[PDB]
Amino acid sequence: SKPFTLPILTLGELTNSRFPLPIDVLYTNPNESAIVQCQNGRCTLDGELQGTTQLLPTGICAFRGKVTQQVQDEHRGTHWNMTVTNLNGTPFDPTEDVPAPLGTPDFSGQIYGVISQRNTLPANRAHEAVIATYSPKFTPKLGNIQFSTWETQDVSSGQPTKFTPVGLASVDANSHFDQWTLPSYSGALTLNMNLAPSVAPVFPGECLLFFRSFIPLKGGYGNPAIDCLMPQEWVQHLYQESAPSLSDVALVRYVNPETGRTLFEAKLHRNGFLTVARNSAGPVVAPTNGYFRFDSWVNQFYTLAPM
Amino acid sequence: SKPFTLPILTLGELTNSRFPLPIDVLYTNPNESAIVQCQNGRCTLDGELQGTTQLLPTGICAFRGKVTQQVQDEHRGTHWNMTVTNLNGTPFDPTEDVPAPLGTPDFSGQIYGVISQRNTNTVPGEGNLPANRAHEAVIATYSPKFTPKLGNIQFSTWETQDVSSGQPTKFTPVGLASVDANSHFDQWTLPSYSGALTLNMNLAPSVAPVFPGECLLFFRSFIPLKGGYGNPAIDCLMPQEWVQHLYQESAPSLSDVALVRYVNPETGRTLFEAKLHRNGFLTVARNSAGPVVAPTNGYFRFDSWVNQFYTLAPM
Ligand SMILES: C[C@@H]1O[C@@H](O[C@@H]2[C@@H](O[C@H]3O[C@H](CO)[C@H](O)[C@H](O)[C@H]3O)[C@@H](O)[C@@H](CO)O[C@@H]2O)[C@@H](O)[C@H](O)[C@@H]1O
């Protein structure tokens, strides 16, 4: 049986699977009331990608497509309707068993980035843009979204268009940032489909452990973060290896290689997420040289050493 | 001896190691007159990172630091000086044996992206949260003010005032501002990391075919443009996932050349073969420039260690 492994990458060598950001800290929040059911950075321990998860770091919260129409918003700014394809350029087939094109953002908010176009030497243009994923016009599962620009006219219809995500536009009350609220991929009255399952601890005293990244803001006050269940390099590693899962729960140790000492241990669950025995919220303070090492297969009743 | 391996990733599952872009096509250009000596995407087959290469896809052509002040520059736009640290936030130590902070761009051009800031100081009335701002920015890596090895660079903005002094600053690369003649885009011309008239140091070595009939094989990505005409590309020697894989594995190199086959897994058939050289680059037996037109399911598979005199089957 092909032995299970994790990459040997320290926190400072890992990136977020839910937004193109480095991992900044490990993080817990035991009193979280939301159902945690993110769709990017989802991969089983035996290498099955789930939700909208794909392998490219460049594909996370990316879109590819063509602009079809300009619409002016009542207040301020210009909106552009965009028909989206798969990230590899092939037509998105809504009948495929995915929630949305792979790479589609998996949270409610105003995602800030750059729209760029290269016409079919060709002419080019790029502008700052915002995609409101909570918008009724955000319907990637139906093959179309809307983005807004400060630019009022210089966006071309019928030309190949790329969205490069950069951060959030805002996290103020009216910007509906909630990292655990899924978009309605087909619009507000339609049920999301083919989702990666929710994740949660099942053992008393345990809480989820997240890989946290701080995300840039176009403006306003805030220090927003995006928490992923596993970094993108773990998704890539699990996918490559496809090691059989020998129980539902792997025991992993967070080790300081310079001392060889275990800093803490965690459960790595079959569906691809971590729990720890910790009764507090906040970052995990751990040496920079640290990384997770697979120890053994255990079960749901294994008692983790308290952090 | 730990066996050498490559990841099993098709072209559509690979990203560029010199700019945050997917790999679009494999590419050759036998008649290239430039010395090929890029500094990102440099890793030996036994896992030694070289040049300015680091592991994070988010770190490639990124900067982290602090704006010091707005500055006057001859060229169009509003200009800003920014100190740069290592990407992990620690001070960059110029005495380290690297050309520049890891992640620094390794080509001449106007690199377009977004500068964002999150203030250090927080406001009680805003729930003890910091103020933020982001704007488009351009870094001209050929500028005499581009001195990342000295811990300082300059960027320009269309925005005329809303960039804060003394605040933590991130550059997220997006593409190029221009490839007009006056924007000096040349993917094989290195920046002067310490400024005009200084010799770059600690470089990853140049790469070249040594065997007649062979040429370099590149992983090519098309890079976005803020404006103007063009279809610019960035060619890397190995994709970022190969850098990450080689670094993990650190398998001993058993000769100077690994024979690899580009395989179509749907047929199991070899489409062509290539030499994967110890220093971390590919050559093929091809006598033309341009894309390699190959089925989308394709990937390289390690076959055996050979020697420099191995004759490749013509592509
Ligand atoms: C907290 C504040 O956030 C950002 O300002 C925005 C405002 O942005 C507008 O004004 C600023 C200058 O004040 C700048 O010109 C920016 O380009 C422009 O769009 C505006 O969005 C208001 C709307 O209520 O919110 C914030 O004040 C940022 O630019 C500021 O530097 C500052 O960090």
B308 lines ligand 1 (CB under 6 A): no
Minimal Cβ distance to A20: which of B8, B58, B123: B58
Least Cα distance to B25 among B291, B286, B239 occurs for B291
CA distance B94 to A17: 32
Gaps in chain B (C–N > 2.5 Å) come after which residues?
A: none
Mode of pairing for the β-strands spanning B281-285 and B269-277: antiparallel
Q: Are residues B33 and B75 in the same domain?
A: no
Same domain assignment for residues A79 and A139: yes
If one counts every other C-beta atom within 10 angstroms of the C-beta of residue B25, the result is 17
**What gap in Å lies between CA B216 and CA B237, rounded to an integer?**
8
In this structure, the strands spanning B227-229 and A123-132 are: antiparallel
**What residues in A contact B112, CB-CB < 8 Å?**
126
How close B173 gets to chain A, by Cα (Å)? 9
Structure tokens at A193: 């489909």
Distance CA A200, CA A208 (A): 7
Structure tokens at A163: 């969205």
Residues 6+ apart with CB under 8 A from A291: A6, A8, A9, A10, A11, A254, A255, A257
> Domain ends where: B148, B177, B206?
B177
> What are the angstrom distances between the C-alpha of A195 and each of A33, A185, A229, B99, B221?
20, 11, 15, 46, 32
Let me know if A258 is exposed, middle or buried by CB neighbors in 10 A (0-12, 13-18, 19+).
Answer: exposed
- Closest residue in B to A15 (Cα) is B56
Whether residue A71 sits in one domain with residue A43: no
Q: Evaluate whether A52 touches A41 at the Cβ level (below 8 Å).
A: no
Q: Is B195 exposed, middle or buried (0-12, 13-18, 19+ CB in 10 A)?
A: middle
Beta bridge partners of B84: B65
The Cα–Cα gap between A5 and A187 comes to: 40
Whether B174 sits inside 8 A of A164 (CB atoms) is: yes
Same domain for A232 and A251, yes or no, is yes
Cβ A253 vs Cβ A295: under 8 Å:
yes
Contact yes or no for A216 and B21 at CB 8 A: no
Q: d(Cα B21, Cα A58) in Å, to the nearest integer?
A: 6
- Amino acid identity, position A103: G
Q: What is the DSSP string of chain B?
A: -PPP------GGG-B-SSSS-B--EEEE-TT--S-B--SSS-B-TTS-B-TT--S-GGGTT-EEEEEEEEE--SSSSEEEEEEE--TTSSPP-TTSSSSSSTT---SBSEEEEEEEEEEEEEEGGGTSEEEEEEEEEEEETTSTT-BGGGTEEEEEESSSS---TTSEEEEEEEEES--SGGG--BTTSPP-TT-TT----SPPPPB---STTEEEEEEEEE--BSEEE---EEEESS-HHHHHHHHHH-PPPSSSEEEEEEEETTTTEEEEEEEEETTTEEEEE----EEE---TT-EEEEEEEE-TTPPPPP-
Judge whether B141 and B108 are in contact, CB under 8 Å: yes
Experimental method: X-ray
Calpha distance B137→B116 (Å, rounded): 10
Ligand 1 atom with the shortest distance to the CA of B119: 33
- Please return the burial class of A3, using the count of CB atoms within 10 Å of its CB with bins 0-12, 13-18 and 19+: exposed
Q: Is residue B123 lining ligand 1, measured as CB closer than 6 Å?
A: no
Among A2, A49, A85, A164, which would you mutate to test the B interface (most chain B Cβ atoms within 10 Å of its Cβ)? A164
The CATH number of the domain where A51 resides is what? 2.40.510.10
Query: Of the residues A144, A169, A194, which one is the last residue of a structural domain?
Result: A169
From atom 25 of ligand 1, which residue's Cα is the shortest distance away?
A: A220
Report how far residue A122's alpha carbon sits from residue A132's, in angstroms, rounded to the nearest whole number. Answer: 30
Question: Which residue type is seen at A113?
Answer: G
Which of B133, B136, B163 to mutate to test ligand 1, by most ligand atoms within 8 A of the CB atom? B133
Query: Is there a contact between B219 and B239 (Cβ–Cβ < 8 Å)?
Result: yes
How many domains would you assign to chain A?
2
Instruction: Tell me how crowded residue A204 is: count the other CB atoms within 10 A of its CB.
Output: 7
Q: Is A182 exposed, middle or buried (0-12, 13-18, 19+ CB in 10 A)?
A: buried
Q: Under a CB-based contact definition with an 8 Å cutoff, are residues B62 and B170 in contact?
A: yes
* Same domain as B249, residue B193: yes
Q: Are A168 and A217 in contact (CB under 8 A)?
A: yes
Given an 8 Å threshold on Cβ–Cβ distance, is B222 in contact with A118?
A: yes
The reply to whether B164 and B213 lie within a common domain is no
- Both A226 and A294 in one domain: the answer is yes
Last residue of a domain, one of A169, A187, A217: A169
Written as one letter, the residue type at A165 is: P
Tell me the CATH number at A93: 2.40.30.120
Our mutation pick for probing the ligand 1 site, out of B122, B123, B157, B162, counting the most ligand atoms within 8 A of Cβ, is: B162
Cβ pair A148, A213 in contact under 8 A:
no
Give B303: exposed, middle or buried? Use CB within 10 Å, 0-12, 13-18, 19+.
middle
Q: Are residues B186 and B298 in the same domain?
A: yes
3-state secondary structure labels for all residues of chain A: CCCCCCCCCCHHHCECCCCCCECCEEEECCCCCCCECCCCCCECCCCCECCCCCCCHHHCCCEEEEEEEEEECCCCCEEEEEEECCCCCCCCCCCCCCCCCCCCCCCECEEEEEEEEECCCCEEEEEEEEEECCCCCCEHHHCEEEEEECCCCCCCECCEEEEEEEEECCCCHHHCCECCCCCCCCCCCCCCCCCCCCECCCCCCEEEEEEEEECCECEEECCCEEEECCCHHHHHHHHHHCCCCCCCEEEEEEEECCCCEEEEEEEEECCCEEEEECCCCEECCCCCCCEEEEEEEECCCCCCCCC
Dihedral-angle region of residue A133 (phi above 0 means left; psi in -120 to 50 means alpha; beta otherwise): alpha
- Inspect the interface and report whether the beta carbons of B123 and A221 lie closer than 8 Å: yes
Residue B185 shares a structural domain with residue B311: yes
**Is B61 exposed, middle or buried (CB count within 10 Å of its CB: 0-12, 13-18, 19+)?**
buried
Same domain, A185 and A246: yes
CA B305 → CA B275, B277, B284, distances in Å?
9, 10, 16
Task: Tell whether A145 and A281 lie within a shared domain.
Answer: no
Contact criterion met (CB below 8 Å) for B221 and B232? no
**Phi, psi (5° rounding) for residue B64?**
-135, 140
Q: What are B186's two structure tokens?
A: 């040349």
Question: Range of A36's domain?
Answer: 1-59+170-307
Residues after which chain A is discontinuous, using a C–N cutoff of 2.5 Å: 120
B227 & B110 share domain:
no
With CB atoms and an 8 Å threshold, state whether A13 touches B228: no
Q: Terminus-to-terminus CA distance in chain B, angstroms?
A: 31
